[PDB]
C-alpha cells in the first residue's frame, strides 16, 4: 500500500516520466498562445 524506500527511486521517476509525457517542455508557450488566440482576442474585440 505504501511506497517502500527500495521502490521509491523507481516510483518517482515513473511519476516524472508521466509528467513529461503528458505536459511536454514547451507547454507554457503552447498554452499561453492558446489562451491568447482563444479568449484574449475576443476580450479585446468586445
Amino acid at each position: 500500500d505504501e511506497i517502500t524506500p527500495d521502490l521509491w527511486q523507481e516510483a518517482c521517476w515513473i511519476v516524472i516520466s508521466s509528467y513529461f509525457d503528458e505536459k511536454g517542455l514547451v507547454r507554457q508557450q503552447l498554452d499561453s498562445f492558446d489562451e491568447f488566440i482563444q479568449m484574449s482576442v475576443q476580450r479585446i474585440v468586445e
Binding site: 517542455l25 514547451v26 508557450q29 503552447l30 498562445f33 492558446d34 488566440i37 482576442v41
Partner: protein, 62 residues
C-alpha cells in the same frame, strides 16, 4: 486570416434603424505559433509530420 463579424445599425431620426451584419470581415493575418492548436501540425502523428518534412521531435513554440 482573422475574420470579425461587424453589425452596423444606421440611426438618423424617426426610429429609422436597420442593422446590417457584415459577417466574416477580414481584419488581418495573425502569425500562428508552430505546434499550437491552430497550426496545421497540431495533433498530427509522427508519420504525417515526416510526410510534411517536419521533425517529430521539434517542440514548436515559435
Amino acid at each position: 486570416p482573422l475574420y470579425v463579424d461587424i453589425t452596423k445599425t444606421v440611426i438618423k431620426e424617426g426610429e429609422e434603424q436597420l442593422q446590417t451584419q457584415h459577417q466574416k470581415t477580414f481584419i488581418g493575418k495573425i502569425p500562428i505559433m508552430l505546434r499550437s492548436t491552430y497550426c496545421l501540425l497540431n495533433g498530427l502523428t509522427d508519420r504525417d509530420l515526416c510526410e510534411l518534412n517536419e521533425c517529430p521531435l521539434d517542440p514548436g513554440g515559435y
